[PDB]
């Protein structure tokens, strides 16, 4: 049988949280395949038809800075990080969905927030009031899987593959981070309570959308020169939106503003106390073996401390 190897350095580092993909854009889909294998087995996709669907997905990704075709691989490796440190948890079913997820889950973003969209009155926005770009995100995804050839789950009954493309709209409509923070305060509740059941479907769901919230955030958990480098990524389109909403009339937040650079150090700080770390934390209280990102993440923290403090600094 074909089984998918990586050079050594890449095999040993591929199975750490902290692990970048690397600049060589051709492994990126080798990568992949070998994750979705030590995953889910040599068995629960045909070869021919996973590289067609990687291809498709890879050419539906488009050029902007953060939200791209490497971005949408990092967030599958950190989804693959999680699995493999929690293997007894996850049905699998939920493994098959939550690698192609990670995959699909920003295709054809074009780098512009939900918020942008209905100022700018983007039809996508009369299409679908909340969630506009996952919701479309979504269909995309279903889109690619109903191309002749590109039908990764074919083997599997009407059920599991309606079972399957629901595991994966709930997980891609999961990534709209305007979902999480009340996400993430049912599940601090139901962990301090003590009701939180992994049997409840229900749970189980908010559980996953925490995972895909922790695997879309995963720059905050690398190490310092990788999380600096995404972070001119990031701001690169942040700035690209509020110039766009200055041509619409608008003063966009200070964070979308490249004339006030100046505060991001401040503002990087806002995102690891509010977003960042109380994601990982309620994370590593459900999934204990999910530490090393809630370290990761703690780290970085320090490094931005460091910067505001002048004994550090990051140049863009
Ligand atoms: C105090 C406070 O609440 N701050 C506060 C709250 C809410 C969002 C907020 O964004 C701060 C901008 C830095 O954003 C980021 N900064 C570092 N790493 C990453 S990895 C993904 C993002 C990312 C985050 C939000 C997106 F909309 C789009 C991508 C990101 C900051
Ligand atoms: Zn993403």
């Given at each position: 049988l074909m089984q998918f190897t990586l050079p050594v350095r890449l095999c040993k580092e591929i199975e750490l949280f902290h692990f970048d993909i690397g600049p060589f854009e051709n492994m990126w889909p080798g990568i992949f395949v070998?994750?979705?294998?030590?995953?889910?087995?040599?068995?629960?996709?045909?070869?021919?038809?996973?590289?067609?669907?990687?291809?498709?997905?890879?050419?539906?990704?488009?050029?902007?800075?953060?939200?791209?075709?490497?971005?949408?691989?990092?967030?599958?490796?950190?989804?693959?990080a999680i699995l493999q440190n929690n293997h007894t948890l996850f049905t699998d079913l939920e493994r098959k969905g939550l690698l192609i997820a990670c995959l699909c889950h920003d295709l054809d973003?074009?780098?512009?927030?939900?918020?942008?969209?209905?100022?700018?009155?983007?039809?996508?926005?009369?299409?679908?009031?909340?969630s506009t770009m996952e919701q479309h995100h979504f269909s995309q995804t279903?889109?690619?899987?109903?191309?002749?050839?590109?039908?990764?789950?074919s083997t599997l009954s009407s059920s599991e593959y309606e079972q399957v493309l629901e595991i994966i709209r709930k997980a891609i409509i999961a990534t709209d981070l305007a979902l999480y923070f009340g996400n993430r305060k049912q599940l601090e509740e139901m962990y301090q309570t003590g009701?939180?059941?992994?049997?409840?479907?229900?749970?189980?769901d908010r559980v996953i959308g925490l995972m895909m919230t922790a695997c879309d955030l995963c720059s905050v958990t690398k190490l310092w020169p990788v999380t600096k480098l995404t972070?001119?990524?990031?701001?690169?389109?942040?700035?690209?939106?509020?110039?766009?909403?200055?041509?619409?009339?608008?003063?966009?937040?200070?964070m979308m503003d490249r004339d006030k650079k100046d505060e991001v150090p401040q503002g990087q700080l806002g995102f690891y106390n509010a977003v960042a770390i109380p994601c990982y934390t309620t994370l590593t209280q459900i999934?204990?073996?999910?530490?090393?990102?809630?370290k990761a993440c703690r780290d970085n923290l320090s490094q931005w401390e460091k910067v505001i403090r002048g004994e550090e600094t990051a140049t863009w």
């Amino acid at each position: 049988l074909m089984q998918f190897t990586l050079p050594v350095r890449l095999c040993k580092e591929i199975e750490l949280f902290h692990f970048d993909i690397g600049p060589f854009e051709n492994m990126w889909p080798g990568i992949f395949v070998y994750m979705v294998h030590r995953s889910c087995g040599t068995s629960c996709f045909e070869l021919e038809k996973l590289c067609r669907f990687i291809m498709s997905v890879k050419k539906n990704y488009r050029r902007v800075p953060y939200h791209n075709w490497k971005h949408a691989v990092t967030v599958a490796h950190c989804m693959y990080a999680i699995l493999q440190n929690n293997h007894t948890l996850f049905t699998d079913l939920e493994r098959k969905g939550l690698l192609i997820a990670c995959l699909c889950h920003d295709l054809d973003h074009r780098g512009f927030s939900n918020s942008y969209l209905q100022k700018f009155d983007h039809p996508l926005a009369a299409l679908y009031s909340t969630s506009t770009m996952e919701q479309h995100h979504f269909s995309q995804t279903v889109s690619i899987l109903q191309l002749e050839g590109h039908n990764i789950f074919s083997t599997l009954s009407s059920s599991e593959y309606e079972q399957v493309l629901e595991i994966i709209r709930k997980a891609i409509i999961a990534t709209d981070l305007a979902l999480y923070f009340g996400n993430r305060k049912q599940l601090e509740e139901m962990y301090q309570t003590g009701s939180l059941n992994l049997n409840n479907q229900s749970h189980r769901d908010r559980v996953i959308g925490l995972m895909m919230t922790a695997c879309d955030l995963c720059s905050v958990t690398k190490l310092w020169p990788v999380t600096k480098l995404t972070a001119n990524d990031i701001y690169a389109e942040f700035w690209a939106e509020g110039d766009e909403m200055k041509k619409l009339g608008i003063q966009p937040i200070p964070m979308m503003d490249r004339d006030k650079k100046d505060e991001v150090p401040q503002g990087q700080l806002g995102f690891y106390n509010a977003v960042a770390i109380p994601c990982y934390t309620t994370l590593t209280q459900i999934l204990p073996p999910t530490e090393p990102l809630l370290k990761a993440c703690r780290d970085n923290l320090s490094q931005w401390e460091k910067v505001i403090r002048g004994e550090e600094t990051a140049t863009w």
